[PDB]
Amino acid sequence: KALSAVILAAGKGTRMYSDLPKVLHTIAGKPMVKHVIDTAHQLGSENIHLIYGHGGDLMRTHLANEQVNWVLQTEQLGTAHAVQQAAPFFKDNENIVVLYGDAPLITKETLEKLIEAKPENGIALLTVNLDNPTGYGRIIRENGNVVAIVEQKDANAEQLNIKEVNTGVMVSDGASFKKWLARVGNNNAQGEYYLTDLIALANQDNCQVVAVQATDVMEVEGANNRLQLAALERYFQNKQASKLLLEGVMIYDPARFDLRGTLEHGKDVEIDVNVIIEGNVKLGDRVKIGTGCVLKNVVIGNDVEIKPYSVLEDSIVGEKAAIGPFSRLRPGAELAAETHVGNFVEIKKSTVGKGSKVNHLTYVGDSEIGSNCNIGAGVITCNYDGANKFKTIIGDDVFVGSDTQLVAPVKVANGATIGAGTTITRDVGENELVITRVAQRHIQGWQRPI
Amino acid sequence: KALSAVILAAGKGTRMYSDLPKVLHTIAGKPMVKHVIDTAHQLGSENIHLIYGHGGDLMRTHLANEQVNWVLQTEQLGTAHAVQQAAPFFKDNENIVVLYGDAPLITKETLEKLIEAKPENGIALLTVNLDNPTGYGRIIRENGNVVAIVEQKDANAEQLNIKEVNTGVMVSDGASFKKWLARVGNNNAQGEYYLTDLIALANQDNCQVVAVQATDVMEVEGANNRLQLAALERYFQNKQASKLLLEGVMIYDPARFDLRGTLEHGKDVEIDVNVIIEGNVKLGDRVKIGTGCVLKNVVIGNDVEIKPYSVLEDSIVGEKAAIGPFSRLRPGAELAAETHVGNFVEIKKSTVGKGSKVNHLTYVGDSEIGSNCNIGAGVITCNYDGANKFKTIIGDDVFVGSDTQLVAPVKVANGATIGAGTTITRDVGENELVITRVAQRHIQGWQRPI
Amino acid sequence: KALSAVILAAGKGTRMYSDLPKVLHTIAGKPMVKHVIDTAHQLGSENIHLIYGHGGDLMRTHLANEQVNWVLQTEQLGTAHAVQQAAPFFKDNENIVVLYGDAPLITKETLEKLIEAKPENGIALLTVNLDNPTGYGRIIRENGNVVAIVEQKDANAEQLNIKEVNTGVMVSDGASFKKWLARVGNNNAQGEYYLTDLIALANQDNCQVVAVQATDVMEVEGANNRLQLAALERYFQNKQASKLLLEGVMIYDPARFDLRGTLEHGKDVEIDVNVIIEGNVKLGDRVKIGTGCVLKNVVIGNDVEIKPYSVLEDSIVGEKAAIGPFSRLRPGAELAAETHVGNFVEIKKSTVGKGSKVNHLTYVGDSEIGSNCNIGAGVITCNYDGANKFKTIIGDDVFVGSDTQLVAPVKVANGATIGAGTTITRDVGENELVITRVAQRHIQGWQRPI
Ligand SMILES: COc1cc2nc(N3CCc4c(ccn(CC5CC5)c4=O)C3)[nH]c(=O)c2cc1OCC1C=C1
Ligand SMILES: COc1cc2nc(N3CCc4c(ccn(CC5CC5)c4=O)C3)[nH]c(=O)c2cc1OCC1C=C1
Ligand SMILES: COc1cc2nc(N3CCc4c(ccn(CC5CC5)c4=O)C3)[nH]c(=O)c2cc1OCC1C=C1
């Protein structure tokens, strides 16, 4: 049967001490609430009702493209009142799962077990075992069913030893939600309408509530401050790393590895310590990434080595290329197979053809470079003091001598040779040699200070 | 009532295998003994008696500016003998707290509880609970008072199960210290005068000794070798990070963060992995620090992003500036609001005005640069082969073409334009364009090797 | 008496998902099997029989220089069958220790205790205690001898509570091995000849099997996938770091330190976070290594500071030199005492004499530089577009002005001075000053865009 989700996302998150609302804070580069939306989506949710409030304008801008129903709650009167705002949109004969935008690590697999266990006209409640369950509502089981959730203050001596606890995550059908939400009261110390009370109300109707234990506590742990958020971060990164290691990626130290997006990999990939992978990255077979590298939105071909302290963004690198150390590839850098990019080199929005080398102290911007070129140390593409930034075109088999400026727009044809220290402003023809004629003054017997 | 401190700092620290004395080894960039002096100071100590011995000359040079009474002990005959060297300086009616220069993590808050609990004419003894208390003197309580400290070898079966242990840290009034120290003997296996024996001597006088438990074991743990020192370091750094996280600083991974000094911060500051903050650093609102950065003695304005692998020292950066990646700011670098400093750029003792950009492969030293300037890739300020290093002055709205050397002393006035590849030795006037006239030899049909 | 080793190394290692065989995967830069060969060697092994199979060609190329007997097993019929392939080479009156190429952390010290405990004509079995011993053969002791190894499935209730477990590591004399291996059968659920069965067979002969507990579990843990391999890596690195710390090396954070080879050190060496030491490295007294540095096959003299993000390979650095930050030393870099190498500088196969400085944005390759030289920012050694790469020779007390290209082959004699922006192609004589005569066009009243 069909399924929809409700995600609670209205919290201010005061203890974050932030201008952002609570659920927009990120884990692995992605807002907490986005993790939960994505999980709801892969679970098969037909609709996702996003209950929001605080920082409303920011929620809308940061999540503009999310396929969710925006339910703006105007007052915080408890979670049952919050969920009830979405209730008119529930189909009677679909399941509804309730999730929390500040508990981002809840998994599809746990939620599939929760939904599968839901008895008809009843509730499936996600629970978890804690070593120190102080403060949290204890799960009371009679037979295989939950008959109550007794809070800390009400529990007797024996009930306090119960380790099983309420997570707030639950699944019931839409008609049942509409019915029971209307019957929730606010007669308690906080004066709030608690979603917790649905368990009691279901039992009032002789409906079955069954418990399903989450396997990992961190799946149901929320973050109320940045300390707790960093704990979720580290747990998540460790889990991502472990998956990659079991898939055959050699991560030298999983505690010093960060993935903030998606990684596609081949076999025998090696990733040294303190590497960050961001956005969508694809690594081919036998790619080796040295320490300190940052790769954001890149495709790296088979047999590429990236040496330490290289930073790459929005770039493509062909097979058997060698990059680094201290290389920077900026958006639009496209390196062909068997290229070489070296230390203190910056490449921006340029193509570099097969076998070409750019190995030191060089800036190449807005350029096309052909195959088997030799770009000397200190070479710089530049522009006139004008308006827009023009293109430098270098053909195949060109030698550009060290410390030469190429002044765009300019074209250097196949097989040209340019001497060191040259300023190139005019087009260079095929097989043309250009050498700078220097004038020097030589003074003999010039004694330097002793 | 008044308070003074005695700090024991005379140890050689043989197992450090160092030419430094034990207590000069650092935690978070600061000598262990300095942590303890600082704590004594914020506790309200009127005097701080520093008992020193081994590496005396080094202690004096490294701690020359500390407001302490230098008590040089000439022979090591135990801690009671050590403290007695300072005793003539104790005021009869002040409290005296005894602390250890090799146990740097003791806190003001723990010591305030210790002092508050001290009964008049008695002692307050700081104790701690250990899971494995083997080797340490057990605390024996009769009623709410300490009647003995029984060492490992003397304890019976039941006394060995006591987890509460002596830390050596204690508070009593000055007259009591002078009295009891004079009565300590050296009749034991080590032949030493132990400060421990004051507890027995107080009980001999029908004076009350009360125990106060330290909350954290690491507060009273000393470091005898560099392995133990690194454990204290990691604990301290984790504690600093946690405080910052609870204050609203987003530290992506607190295990990969080091603060070696003080940090002042605004709201919504983000600090990526492997950042080191040294000396006194001030970060404004919404500052983002990328991975690998080192900031020492810097002020960073609101909305600055520092990209990966940037190293900054003794520098100021205005709001909305963009630094990095691979940028180096050396002492005296002052960047105005909305500036841009890029990869493989070094700025030393120079001011850079609002909106100006220095984005690649450049050295700017001893310079003043105005607003809205464009400093091209490969630009270098340099000097003649002479004596001292002179200044380059660049005005507002100046364009300096790529790979130009500016030869100090020289002035470039407002609105000037300098072509690429220029050597500037003479002053450039307002709205003056300077272009290098190059001579080139062009040889057609020059075939390069196949 | 004599000793030889047998090392089992034939596994495919399917769950590594690799083109490499299992035991060639590295820990601290060295194949797992190599760790075990090295341990066997320092134990005093006369012969080392290496049982190999899967990835045979790769084993032979990667371990070509290992002093081992290559025993190629053609079918996998169990470990007893494997060891029996080597048995014809066992001397009757030598001890034989059996080790595993996928359990690299086994130590010499543990193995010496194992061998010492071996009763004559009997077996010494290495065992270990586990908290959860499920799946592993339990050690059954009657008196001080092992009478059986009962597998999980056969054990009764009380035997499952035994925490002591079989590691597979054992020592017996050669004649005993030849005898008992011939009597091992394959009547079990897997149809394999298990080396485990020797314990039963020894007991059949009224021969004594004695247990020896390994002190650390990680010594006998094998790695079947890259997750488990990373755990061994981290344990090994922590152990190496701890040893260095106890020897007096200040490693600021042992969890962010990697040694992949050997380290020789003096006193008062400091190593900041995220440093990697590879190959054979020697550091003198008071060497300070900043964060992010990579040192591979280097000798560093007394009192050298290496500042952050410096990468050094196959290089020598004299006392009191200063390197970094952002310095790169490539193979053959030899820096004399009191030299200075700075940011965005690359030195390859060059010698730099005492007191000389190369402090910014410079490439020096295939060069000899003398004492007290000043190599300006932007200086580049380069070659003509020819065949091989020639040498630049610079004498003592030479000043090379900024952004000068030195075009090899060329010689600059003692005391020469070269102006900024020069192209040097011809030899410069002693005390010769060379200055570039520039031609410039100056255009007054050139208004740039507003
Ligand atoms: C960010 O928005 C909200 C997230 C919210 N998240 C939760 N939960 C996630 C965190 C959490 C919950 C229950 C138990 N635990 C402890 C874990 C051991 C079991 C949690 O961490 C329930 N519970 C809430 O009541 C809630 C309200 C929120 O506010 C909106 C709704 C109107 C109130
Ligand atoms: C560096 O100088 C000294 C530091 C010293 N520090 C200490 N303590 C700090 C370390 C420490 C102490 C007591 C217990 N513990 C274990 C912890 C569980 C409780 C300590 O780590 C006492 N105890 C000393 O006797 C001492 C002597 C020292 O030498 C000078 C004084 C003349 C002897
Ligand atoms: C890589 O090659 C092999 C390594 C092999 N390594 C082992 N061991 C190392 C790993 C390991 C063993 C025993 C117990 N444990 C668990 C630890 C708690 C005690 C191990 O991890 C024995 N045991 C094997 O049977 C074996 C076979 C191997 O295959 C070759 C031989 C023909 C089969």
Distance from CA of B331 to the nearest CA of C (A): 14
Tokens 């930050």 found at: C325
Query: Using an 8 Å Cβ cutoff, are A33 and A9 in contact?
Result: yes
Query: Using an 8 Å Cβ cutoff, are C4 and C49 in contact?
Result: yes
Query: Using an 8 Å Cβ cutoff, are B16 and C248 in contact?
Result: yes
Domains in chain B, start-ordered, CATH in brackets? Answer: 1-224 (3.90.550.10), 225-450 (2.160.10.10)
Compare CB distances from C440 to B276, B311, B436 and report the shortest one's residue: B436
The tokens for C417 are 């001075």
Strand A250-251 relative to strand A270-271, pairing? parallel
Query: Using an 8 Å Cβ cutoff, are C50 and C68 in contact?
Result: yes
Query: Using an 8 Å Cβ cutoff, are B320 and B338 in contact?
Result: yes
Q: In B, which residues are within 8 Å of A443 by CB distance?
A: none
A420 to chain C, any CB pair closer than 8 A? The answer is: yes
Query: Using an 8 Å Cβ cutoff, are B345 and A328 in contact?
Result: no
Asked if B403 lies within 8 A of A385 by C-beta distance, the reply is: no
H helices within B154-194, ranges in order?
157-160, 174-181
Distance from C-alpha of C329 to C-alpha of C309, rounded to nearest angstrom: 12
Beta bridge partners of A82: none
Asked if A435 lies within 8 A of B439 by C-beta distance, the reply is: no
Measured at the CA of B259, the angle between CA B257 and CA B260, to 5 degrees, comes to: 140
A396 to chain B, any CB pair closer than 8 A? The answer is: no
Residue A161 DSSP label: T
Residue A215 burial (CB count, 10 A): 10
Helix (H, G, I), strand (E, B), or coil: what is residue B450?
Answer: coil
Residue B360 annotated to the active site: yes
Query: Using an 8 Å Cβ cutoff, are C143 and C67 in contact?
Result: no
- Which residues are CB-contacts of A106 (< 8 A; sequence separation ≥ 6)? A36, A39, A99, A100, A169, A214, A219, A220
- Which residues are CB-contacts of B204 (< 8 A; sequence separation ≥ 6)? none
Compare CB distances from A440 to C344, C437, C439 and report the shortest one's residue: C437
H helices within B163-225, ranges in order?
174-181, 198-204
CA dihedral C172, C173, C179, C180 (to 10 degrees): 0
C245 to chain A, any CB pair closer than 8 A? The answer is: no
Q: Which one, of C400, C412, C397, lies nearest residue C353 by Cα?
A: C397
Measured at the CA of C172, the angle between CA C166 and CA C175, to 5 degrees, comes to: 140
Q: Which one, of A194, A177, A176, lies nearest residue A49 by Cα?
A: A177
- Residues C66, C70, C76, C79: is their CA dihedral positive or negative? negative
Residue C373 burial (CB count, 10 A): 24
Distance from C-alpha of B170 to C-alpha of C439, rounded to nearest angstrom: 81
- DSSP of A183-214, one letter per residue? T----STT----GGGHHHHHHHTT--EEEEE-
Amino acid type, C14? T
Atom 7 in ligand 3: residue holding the nearest Cα: C100
Tokens 């410390």 found at: A403
Q: Which one, of A112, A28, A21, lies nearest residue A61 by Cα?
A: A21
Measured at the CA of C354, the angle between CA C349 and CA C360, to 5 degrees, comes to: 65
Ligand 3 centroid to residue C401 C-alpha, Å: 64
Q: In C, which residues are within 8 Å of B382 by CB distance?
A: 376-377, 401-403, 420
- DSSP of A90-152, one letter per residue? --TTSEEEEEETT-TT--HHHHHHHHHHPPTTSEEEEEEE-SS-TTSPEEEEETTEEEEEE-T
What was the resolution (in A) of this experimentally determined structure? Answer: 2.0
Long-range residue pairs from C72-79, CB within 8 A, at least 24 positions apart, any chain: C73/C10, C76/C10, C77/C186, C77/C192, C77/C193, C78/C186, C78/C190, C78/C192, C78/C193, C78/C194, C78/C195, C79/C8, C79/C168, C79/C192, C79/C193, C79/C194, C79/C195, C79/C196
* Three-class SS of chain C: CCEEEEEECCCCCHHHCCCCCHHHCEECCEEHHHHHHHHHHHHCCCCEEEEEECEHHHHHHHCCCCCCEEEECCCCCCHHHHHHHHHHHCCCCCEEEEEECCCCCCCHHHHHHHHHHCCCCCEEEEEEECCCCCCCCEEEEECCEEEEEECCCCCCHHHHCCCEEEEEEEEEEHHHHHHHHCCCCCCCCCCCCCHHHHHHHHHHCCCCEEEEECCCHHHCCCCCCHHHHHHHHHHHHHHHHHHHHHCCCEECCHHHEEEEEEEEECCCCEECCCEEEEEEEEECCCCEECCCCEEEEEEECCCCEECCCCEEEEEEECCCCEECCCEEECCCCEECCCCEEEEEEEEECCEECCCCEEEEEEEEECEEECCCCEECCCCEEEECCCCCCCCEEECCCCEECCCCEEEECEEECCCCEECCCCEECCCECCCCEEEEECEEEEECCCCCCC
Q: How many residues does chain A have?
A: 450
CA atoms within 13 A on the CB side of C59: 23
Query: Using an 8 Å Cβ cutoff, are A252 and A268 in contact?
Result: no
- Which residues are CB-contacts of A92 (< 8 A; sequence separation ≥ 6)? A173, A174, A175, A178
Residues of A255-289 as b/e, b for ≥16 C-beta within 10 angstroms?
A: bbbbbbeebebbbbbbbbbbbbbbeebbbbebbbb
Burial class of A389 by CB neighbour count within 10 A (0 to 12, 13 to 18, 19+):
middle
- What phi, psi does C244 have (nearest 5°)? -65, -40
Distance from C-alpha of A421 to C-alpha of C405, rounded to nearest angstrom: 7
Helix (H, G, I), strand (E, B), or coil: what is residue B378?
Answer: coil
Query: Using an 8 Å Cβ cutoff, are B398 and B379 in contact?
Result: no
Q: What distance, in Å, lies between the first and last C-alpha atoms of chain B?
A: 92
Amino acid type, B284? G
- What phi, psi does B201 have (nearest 5°)? -65, -35
Residues with CB under 6 A from ligand 3: C 8-11, 22-23, 76, 79, 82, 100-103, 128, 136, 165, 167-168, 220-222
Distance from C-alpha of A50 to C-alpha of C172, rounded to nearest angstrom: 70
Helix (H, G, I), strand (E, B), or coil: what is residue B326?
Answer: coil
Query: Using an 8 Å Cβ cutoff, are A386 and A369 in contact?
Result: no
Distance from C-alpha of B382 to C-alpha of C362, rounded to nearest angstrom: 14
- Which residues are CB-contacts of C403 (< 8 A; sequence separation ≥ 6)? A378, A403, B378, B380, B382, B403, B405, C376, C377, C378, C379, C420, C421
Residue B428 DSSP label: B
Q: What distance, in Å, lies between the first and last C-alpha atoms of chain C?
A: 92
Crossing angle between the packed helical segments B226-246 and A226-246, to the nearest 10 degrees = 120
Residues of A415-439 as b/e, b for ≥16 C-beta within 10 angstroms?
A: bbbbbbbbbbbeebbebbbbbbebe
Chain B, 351-370: which have a CB under 8 Å from a chain C CB?
A: 361-363
Tokens 């750094």 found at: B237
Residue B185 burial (CB count, 10 A): 11
Measured at the CA of B5, the angle between CA B1 and CA B8, to 5 degrees, comes to: 160
Q: In B, which residues are within 8 Å of C360 by CB distance?
A: 346, 363, 380
Residue C291 burial (CB count, 10 A): 23
Method by which the model was determined: X-ray
Measured at the CA of A323, the angle between CA A319 and CA A329, to 5 degrees, comes to: 100
Query: Using an 8 Å Cβ cutoff, are C53 and C74 in contact?
Result: yes
Residue A2 burial (CB count, 10 A): 13
Interruptions in chain A after residues (C–N over 2.5 Å): none
A343 to chain B, any CB pair closer than 8 A? The answer is: no
Tokens 């001598």 found at: A401
Q: Which one, of C163, B74, C277, B285, lies nearest residue A19 by Cα?
A: B285
Crossing angle between the packed helical segments B79-86 and B174-181, to the nearest 10 degrees = 130
Q: What are chain B's partners, defined as 3 or more CB pairs within 8 angstroms? A: A, C
Distance from C-alpha of C374 to C-alpha of B396, rounded to nearest angstrom: 32
Residue B437 burial (CB count, 10 A): 10
Distance from C-alpha of C345 to C-alpha of A361, rounded to nearest angstrom: 9
CA dihedral B419, B422, B423, B429 (to 10 degrees): -10
A259 to chain C, any CB pair closer than 8 A? The answer is: no
Crossing angle between the packed helical segments A174-181 and A79-86, to the nearest 10 degrees = 130
Query: Using an 8 Å Cβ cutoff, are A5 and A43 in contact?
Result: yes
Compute the radius of gyration of chain A from its Cα atoms. 31
Could you tell me the CA-to-CA distances from B109 to B39, B46, B216, B238 in Å, in that order? 10, 18, 12, 18
Beta bridge partners of C148: C140
Measured at the CA of B171, the angle between CA B59 and CA B211, to 5 degrees, comes to: 125
B417 to chain C, any CB pair closer than 8 A? The answer is: yes
Q: How many residues does chain B have?
A: 450
Q: How many residues does chain C have?
A: 450
Distance from C-alpha of A290 to C-alpha of A279, rounded to nearest angstrom: 19
Element (H, E) at B396: none
Distance from C-alpha of B270 to C-alpha of B244, rounded to nearest angstrom: 11
Query: Using an 8 Å Cβ cutoff, are A67 and A40 in contact?
Result: no
Q: How far is CA B299 from the centre of its chain?
A: 17
Q: Which residue of B has its CA nearest to A438?
A: B439
- What phi, psi does C126 have (nearest 5°)? -75, 125
Q: Which one, of C110, C113, C126, C95, lies nearest residue C196 by Cα?
A: C126
Distance from C-alpha of B109 to C-alpha of B39, rounded to nearest angstrom: 10
- What phi, psi does C415 have (nearest 5°)? 80, 5
Ligand 3 pocket mutation, candidates C6, C7, C8, C235, criterion most atoms within 8 A of CB: C8
- DSSP of B234-279, one letter per residue? HHHHHHHHHHHHHTT-EES-GGGEEEEEEEEE-SS-EE-SSEEEEE
Tokens 């899971």 found at: B131
Q: What is the number of the ligand 2 atom nearest to the C-alpha of B195?
A: 25
* Chain A interface disruption, residue of C224, C257, C423, C441, most A CBs within 10 A: C423
Residue B447 burial (CB count, 10 A): 9
Burial class of C264 by CB neighbour count within 10 A (0 to 12, 13 to 18, 19+):
exposed
The tokens for C16 are 């590594």
Query: Using an 8 Å Cβ cutoff, are A438 and A422 in contact?
Result: no
- What phi, psi does C166 have (nearest 5°)? -80, 130
Burial class of C154 by CB neighbour count within 10 A (0 to 12, 13 to 18, 19+):
exposed
Residues of B318-344 as b/e, b for ≥16 C-beta within 10 angstroms?
A: bbbbbbbbbbbbbebbbbbbbbbbbbb
Q: What is the number of the ligand 1 atom nearest to the C-alpha of A165?
A: 19
Q: In A, which residues are within 8 Å of B403 by CB distance?
A: 378, 380, 382, 403, 405
Could you tell me the CA-to-CA distances from B156 to B140, B152, B159, B246, C119 in Å, in that order? 12, 9, 5, 46, 40
Query: Using an 8 Å Cβ cutoff, are C271 and C247 in contact?
Result: no
- DSSP of B352-375, one letter per residue? E-TT-EEEEEEEEESEEE-TT-EE
Distance from C-alpha of B174 to C-alpha of B83, rounded to nearest angstrom: 11
Residues of C annotated catalytic, as ranges: 360
User: Is the minimum distance from the CB of B9 to ligand 2 under 6 angstroms?
Assistant: yes
Distance from C-alpha of C406 to C-alpha of C412, rounded to nearest angstrom: 9
